[PDB]
Design a protein around this ligand. Structure first.
Ligand SMILES: NC(=O)C1=CN([C@@H]2O[C@H](COP(=O)(O)OP(=O)(O)OC[C@H]3O[C@@H](n4cnc5c(N)ncnc54)[C@H](OP(=O)(O)O)[C@@H]3O)[C@@H](O)[C@H]2O)C=CC1
Lengths: 379, 379
């Protein structure tokens, strides 16, 4: 009853939290593989030494050289590790487009895919879906973990609406006027979670929410007009399902990713002590407010891309990555991230064709990146 | 397929709401029996005329003299109607001690029992539990209904805590000094057309919550030390379950008893359009604060009684019935209600024996009422 776990992106936030869950629960889990990029070698060496796992992939060839003895090195190291390691669960916590091929490799093996890497579902679309058995993909993000728990509240035909919650970002309440003046560091701190410069920016622009709506449709098969977003500044309620009789079932916990991680690794079984529970011996308040879809149209823009289907969500994602890098570099303003997403989706006519192979997906992203660059060039 | 329903207590708040749900859903339910006390004989005869159901019971023989074609009249009329009617669901929405035998009769038929009658579990306890098969009893109360929905979020083994919500009453936040000046009218006592004087008062005193804690223990088999109460003034979250991993699942809806009534009737199948869903288009907040157990000790007393066991919860409730009536009759002050419950309970250890018959329960109750009357009068 012990699950063999491959951890991809082991040195990041999710990767390290997942290793602590596995360390705490040797009854339930064992690490059998680690993959990293090569940029934090001290962490990875520390992880090799602490877990005793030598079955390691490192993307950067130079960093893998620097370390020596690494059995998998290069841009396909993570994919090859997954292909050649027997495991029950593959945790994909890699960042960006490079999570796609290791996602596809993992699905092919039969292992449960515990998915933090959103880009692989968002961009992979039906390519990833065709490769997956029912229930094989288990979401790691707290919103989707919340949804999966809440769906147990009824049969599938009893689902009326999925309700995703959003923190609302640092600029909740701000008008369009004052969104123009946002600096790369004003969008650099998140109220409840501590994440990377990209992932914290995606919370500020509401594109992380947009992307999660896409993932929600792809994970659970609920239509886009039945997936709602509500602003909940506290991030204690992580999501809800409303049923056909009027009942809403909600999931709540203090923000700690170890909870959704442990549940994604152990699914369907809950992992005793994974995280602290809500304390009802002290006063608290859960506030909800409607999202401002005029100032923050990134979610509706994600529905539009999602309804168009095929490779259009790959376009929505890839356009974001490029426009976001331009923001962090200092080349474009804050509102220009979503404005450029809009302009790129409007030109992306051809990319509504369903992908047959990874290259179709790769072809759409290439186009979107270029088109996104051309839009940046114009300002 | 269609469920045949017997409605006991048809002329009350729950019973009439249940008949509305049955009338809006002829596909799901048909009424096959109706039982009332006699005080609202006119309502029952209009119900007979409206539904076409002639299979009716009237407890009051004197009131039954007015009609001449009631197949079941007198004492145990409701019990006899239960024994002699083929049904799939018995809704027991009878008030007080006269709900206990129809509950037992209903369990013996092997029909599902939708239980609103509090005395069945609070007084009848082990008599009712030993007579019931697993899943046979489905609760009608909004809190218990919330708990049953939330328990879907994991296995029985995965439960850490049940958390009942409480409005806190009209004297939420009041000091012990504040409570000294409490009048019957302040405690929500008005000549309301369906609201019994007791249930408003039991909510103001926190005895309703005590009673619900006792029933939670018996319905769900969770230790008293793992059943909590949080104050929640909005009454949108109707109760919650905390699981062993630290995740809490909560049930939420705008107050409307037709939701938990519909689900109780159709269990485990939800009833489309039963009640309005939470609306997140407009801002709101769900507030939680701990209960001040020094000013409001009624729930800890309920746990004391329930742990003591046997007929002690019967004593708890009868001692309340008497004390609460005396406060309404201006013979005692508000704080003396729960004060008097403590004193009767402290002197009551002889009733910690398990009841063998309905009579054992009646004897305990008789004792508790007399002992409480003593305390009221100064004897
Ligand atoms: N943290 C959170 O709570 C949330 C996470 N997510 C999602 O989780 C995913 C993971 O990001 P997060 O853990 O949060 O990330 P981090 O940025 O903290 O870490 C990402 C990991 O990917 C590795 N990596 C980077 N480049 C490569 C590459 N060239 N080849 C192989 N591995 C590489 C990194 O290794 P190294 O740095 O050593 O090079 C690192 O271990 C994201 O897609 C994000 O959308 C979603 C919602 C919130």
């Amino acid at each position: 009853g012990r699950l063999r776990v491959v951890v991809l992106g082991s040195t990041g936030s999710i990767g390290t939290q997942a290793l602590q869950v596995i360390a705490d629960n040797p009854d339930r889990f064992e690490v059998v593989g680690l993959a990293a990029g090569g940029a934090h070698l001290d962490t990875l060496l520390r992880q090799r030494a602490q877990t005793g796992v030598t079955n390691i992939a490192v993307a950067d060839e130079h960093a893998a050289q620097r370390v020596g003895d690494i059995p998998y090195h290069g841009s396909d190291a993570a994919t090859r590790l997954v292909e050649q390691t027997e495991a029950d669960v593959v945790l994909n916590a890699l960042v960006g487009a490079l999570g796609l091929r290791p996602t596809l490799a993992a699905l092919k093996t039969g292992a449960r895919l515990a998915l933090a890497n959103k880009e692989s579902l968002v961009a992979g679309g039906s390519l990833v879906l065709r490769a997956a058995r029912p229930g094989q993909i288990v979401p790691v993000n707290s919103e989707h973990s919340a949804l999966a728990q809440c769906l147990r509240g009824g049969t599938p035909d009893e689902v009326a609406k999925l309700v995703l919650t959003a923190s609302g970002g640092p600029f909740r309440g701000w008008s369009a006027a004052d969104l123009e003046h946002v600096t790369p560091e004003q969008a650099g701190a998140h109220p409840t979670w501590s994440m990377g410069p990209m992932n914290t920016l995606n919370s500020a622009s509401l594109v992380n929410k947009g992307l999660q709506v896409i993932e929600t449709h792809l994970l659970f098969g609920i239509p886009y007009d039945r997936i709602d977003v509500v602003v909940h500044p506290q991030s204690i309620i992580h999501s809800m399902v409303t049923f056909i009789d009027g009942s809403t079932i909600a999931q709540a916990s203090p923000p700690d990713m170890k909870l959704p991680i442990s549940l994604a690794l152990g699914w369907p079984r809950r992992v005793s002590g994974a995280a602290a529970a809500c304390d009802f011996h002290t006063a608290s308040s859960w506030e909800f407010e409607p999202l401002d879809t005029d100032v923050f149209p990134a979610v509706e823009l994600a529905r539009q891309a999602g309804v168009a289907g095929g490779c259009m969500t790959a376009v929505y994602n890839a356009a974001n990555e490029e426009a976001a890098a331009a923001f962090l570099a200092g080349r474009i303003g804050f509102p220009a991230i979503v404005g450029i997403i809009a302009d790129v989706l409007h030109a992306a006519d051809q990319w509504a064709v369903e992908p047959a192979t990874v290259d179709d997906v790769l072809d759409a992203q290439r186009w979107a990146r270029e088109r996104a660059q051309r839009a940046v060039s114009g300002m």
